[PDB]
Amino acid sequence: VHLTPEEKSAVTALWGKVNVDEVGGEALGRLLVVYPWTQRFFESFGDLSTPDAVMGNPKVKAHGKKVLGAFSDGLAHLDNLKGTFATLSELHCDKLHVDPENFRLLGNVLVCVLAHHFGKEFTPPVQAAYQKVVAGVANALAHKYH
Amino acid sequence: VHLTPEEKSAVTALWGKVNVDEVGGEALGRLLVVYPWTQRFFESFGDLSTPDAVMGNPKVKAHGKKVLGAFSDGLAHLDNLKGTFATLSELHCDKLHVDPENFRLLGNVLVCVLAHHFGKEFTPPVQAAYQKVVAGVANALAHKYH
Amino acid sequence: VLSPADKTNVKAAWGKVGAHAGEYGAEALERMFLSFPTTKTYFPHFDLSHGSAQVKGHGKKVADALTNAVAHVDDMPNALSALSDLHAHKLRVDPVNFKLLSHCLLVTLAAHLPAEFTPAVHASLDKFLASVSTVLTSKYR
Amino acid sequence: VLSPADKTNVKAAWGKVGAHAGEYGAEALERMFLSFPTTKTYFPHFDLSHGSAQVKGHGKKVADALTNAVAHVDDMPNALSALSDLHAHKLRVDPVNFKLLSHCLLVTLAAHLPAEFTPAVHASLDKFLASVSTVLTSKYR
Ligand code: HEM
Ligand code: HEM
Ligand code: HEM
Numbered sequence: 001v002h003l004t005p006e007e008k009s010a011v012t013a014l015w016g017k018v019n020v021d022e023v024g025g026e027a028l029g030r031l032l033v034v035y036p037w038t039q040r041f042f043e044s045f046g047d048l049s050t051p052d053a054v055m056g057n058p059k060v061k062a063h064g065k066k067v068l069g070a071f072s073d074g075l076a077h078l079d080n081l082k083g084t085f086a087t088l089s090e091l092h093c094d095k096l097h098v099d100p101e102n103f104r105l106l107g108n109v110l111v112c113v114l115a116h117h118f119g120k121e122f123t124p125p126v127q128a129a130y131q132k133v134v135a136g137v138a139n140a141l142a143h144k145y146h
Numbered sequence: 147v148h149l150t151p152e153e154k155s156a157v158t159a160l161w162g163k164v165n166v167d168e169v170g171g172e173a174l175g176r177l178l179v180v181y182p183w184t185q186r187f188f189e190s191f192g193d194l195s196t197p198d199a200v201m202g203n204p205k206v207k208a209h210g211k212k213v214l215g216a217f218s219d220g221l222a223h224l225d226n227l228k229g230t231f232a233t234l235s236e237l238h239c240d241k242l243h244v245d246p247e248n249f250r251l252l253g254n255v256l257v258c259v260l261a262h263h264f265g266k267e268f269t270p271p272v273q274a275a276y277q278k279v280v281a282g283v284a285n286a287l288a289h290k291y292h
Numbered sequence: 293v294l295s296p297a298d299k300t301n302v303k304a305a306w307g308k309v310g311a312h313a314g315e316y317g318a319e320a321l322e323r324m325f326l327s328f329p330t331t332k333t334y335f336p337h338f339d340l341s342h343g344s345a346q347v348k349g350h351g352k353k354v355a356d357a358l359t360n361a362v363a364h365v366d367d368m369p370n371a372l373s374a375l376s377d378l379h380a381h382k383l384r385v386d387p388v389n390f391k392l393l394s395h396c397l398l399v400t401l402a403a404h405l406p407a408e409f410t411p412a413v414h415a416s417l418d419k420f421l422a423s424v425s426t427v428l429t430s431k432y433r
Numbered sequence: 434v435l436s437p438a439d440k441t442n443v444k445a446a447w448g449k450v451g452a453h454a455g456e457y458g459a460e461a462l463e464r465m466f467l468s469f470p471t472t473k474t475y476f477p478h479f480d481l482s483h484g485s486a487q488v489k490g491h492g493k494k495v496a497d498a499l500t501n502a503v504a505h506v507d508d509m510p511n512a513l514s515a516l517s518d519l520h521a522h523k524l525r526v527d528p529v530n531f532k533l534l535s536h537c538l539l540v541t542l543a544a545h546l547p548a549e550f551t552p553a554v555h556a557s558l559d560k561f562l563a564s565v566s567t568v569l570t571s572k573y574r
């Protein structure tokens with residue numbers, strides 16, 4: 001994955017408007033509601049039995065904020081995604097035992113969340129840029145698995 | 147995908163005893179048999195109505211040797227497959243309209259064929275090296291799509 | 293398993309889509325062609341530029357199919373039978389692409405349904421589109 | 434959609450597999466862990482070392498469940514119902530991994546039963562494993 005100057009521009013421009021903490025809680029919450037098997041890694045978060053339980057779970061919100069926060073920092077190095085997520089990749093593999101397919105599912109949910117928040121401003125070209133970003137991030141996070 | 151130095155040696159080694167033309171026809175034939183929708187690019191090949199017809203079709207064999215011939219050449223450029231398959235990638239996109247998923251299916255079928263051909267010798271570690279290679283080749287062939 | 297609960301969430305959401313179905317269908321296709329370029333390999337006979345009348349027209353047909361599926365959600369296999377055959381034996385679109393279009397349809401819906409696109413409805417719509425996709429590829433082999 | 438041809442092909446090819454379930458199953462697992470390392474994320478509680486009792490035992494259980502499915506290929510939804518519940522509500526293995534294991538099972542069969550692994554049988558076995566996978570993931574959401 002490699003973003004063109006225009007795709008990087010579209011990503012950076014849109015991200016400045018984003019409330020990372022808010023979108024993070026929304027994206028992780030939806031991941032757990034839409035693809036319930038992803039809850040397998042969050043039993044320690046407590047109650048995830050219903051949409052309202054998941055979306056209102058304080059630990060889910062807190063983790064969403066952490067996850068998108070790391071994602072946000074990675075957007076500063078759009079041409080070096082593997083390197084910027086290398087250590088987190090090793091850790092998600094060795095310590096957390098998280099199947100990278102989850103990073104792809106979260107990526108797609110994030111795009112849906114951005115579309116939901118921005119509406120018409122989330123144009124087809126902007127989506128394309130973000131679709132590339134989430135794919136690159138998922139690939140970077142999966143790169144050090146062994 | 148990046149294979150370890152030893153995996154590259156394992157790949158180039160098992161290959162030394164591969165009749166590229168023969169395995170190519172077998173792999174392409176099984177692709178058309180197992181995933182029949184892939185026959186969409188070969189209506190000019192004639193009889194593809196049954197497994198026997200497909201496998202024995204001279205055009206299927208002819209195209210198979212063409213495809214695996216290029217795959218074989220790629221094994222001498224394992225450090226940068228995208229660069230080596232660039233123009234071929236542009237051709238498959240601009241003139242042939244071949245969905246890259248086809249390369250991934252062919253890759254898996256090829257692995258099944260190498261297993262069928264080498265039997266006992268196609269050990270789990272050897273398969274892993276080849277599994278990495280077919281993915282690398284498929285990704286390289288898909289790189290110039292637009 | 294599109295549950296009865298999913299079915300009614302879809303009927304309500306698609307009902308809200310209402311007269312914009314065709315527009316959203318075309319928009320979803322446009323989004324797919326830009327986000328997933330490999331899907332363009334199935335339309336070499338189409339001008340895939342922004343605003344293409346061919347993409348717009350096809351979008352209305354995709355929407356017709358979805359609307360019809362929603363109207364016969366209790367027997368989608370029958371409702372989508374002609375299309376299942378078409379994609380399986382003529383078009384022969386690789387199964388992986390249905391997930392790409394489905395995702396783009398969800399994105400399009402999310403971009404147009406501020407209040408309706410709740411987490412629960414989002415899940416139901418995803419399952420609905422997956423069900424439609426499964427039906428459309430049920431005759432491939 | 435297992436046709437009468439697929440059923441006949443699978444039953445005829447599986448004969449020698451079911452006779453050595455543990456061997457075939459364990460090898461398919463090792464092939465999967467080495468070829469698709471991400472699958473190891475589901476077995477952090479296993480010593481995945483070559484030839485371990487845990488891998489051998491699980492390989493046998495996987496192979497035995499498949500042998501039962503072949504024996505009752507006319508009613509896989511019920512034959513695999515309990516196992517479906519387990520993967521859907523507890524194991525929660527992402528659906529993409531079923532394709533990886535299925536592929537590794539085919540490779541294992543190709544490497545061990547070349548006479549049986551003809552193109553037609555290869556096609557039926559792939560369809561069979563995909564059907565098993567479908568049932569096993571049918572209750573995920
Ligand atoms: C954009 C993708 C992702 C990024 C950038 C990311 C980032 C992070 C970071 C920075 C942490 C450290 C949190 C801490 O210990 O304080 C973390 C922990 C974790 N992540 Fe990821 N992650 C991503 C996706 C996911 C997904 C999709 C899952 C699984 C469905 C996942 C599961 C976990 C788990 C289980 C933890 C431990 C949580 C805890 O112990 O409280 N991550 N991740
Ligand atoms: C490892 C993957 C593959 C490689 C390395 C590859 C390589 C090639 C090569 C070298 C050519 C000839 C180019 C020339 O004219 O100089 C070619 C042609 C072609 N390939 Fe691919 N290919 C691959 C997979 C596929 C697959 C899976 C399909 C579709 C099912 C496909 C369909 C075509 C078609 C339709 C042609 C034109 C054949 C003709 O006009 O006779 N290729 N490919
Ligand atoms: C939600 C899933 C989908 C639906 C409901 C759908 C619906 C349709 C419909 C209604 C038609 C018109 C058939 C006719 O005129 O009788 C059609 C044609 C077509 N579809 Fe699908 N389709 C779906 C997904 C796909 C995907 C994923 C691709 C490829 C990326 C695809 C490629 C085509 C092509 C190439 C045509 C022919 C267009 C033309 O020449 O006018 N479809 N589809």
Ligand code: HEM
Nearest residue numbers: 472475476491494495498499516524526530531534535565
């Ligand atoms: C051909 C498809 C598959 C079959 C037939 C199958 C069958 C089974 C069976 C029979 C069990 C034992 C349940 C018991 O103890 O009663 C099981 C457990 C399990 N399966 Fe699946 N499975 C399949 C695919 C997968 C895949 C793709 C993965 C993940 C890569 C997976 C991960 C697991 C895990 C983690 C366990 C529990 C292991 C343990 O702690 O004992 N399964 N499966």
Ligand SMILES: *[C@@H](CC(=O)c1ccc(OCCCC(=O)O)c(Cl)c1Cl)c1ncc[nH]1
Nearest residue numbers: 387429430431432433434435560563564567
């Ligand atoms: C029977 C088998 C069958 O008809 C079938 C096997 C494999 C296929 O490949 C595409 C996978 C779709 C996906 O994962 O998105 C297709 Cl399209 C078919 Cl139709 C059967 N019986 C119950 C289930 N399958």
Ligand SMILES: *[C@H](CC(=O)c1ccc(OCCCC(=O)O)c(Cl)c1Cl)c1ncc[nH]1
Nearest residue numbers: 293294422423426528529570571572573574
């Ligand atoms: C049932 C609907 C259903 O419950 C369902 C829909 C979609 C799913 O997607 C899995 C994605 C596969 C992958 O990305 O690897 C899953 Cl797991 C389920 Cl369980 C239904 N009804 C008709 C057809 N299917």
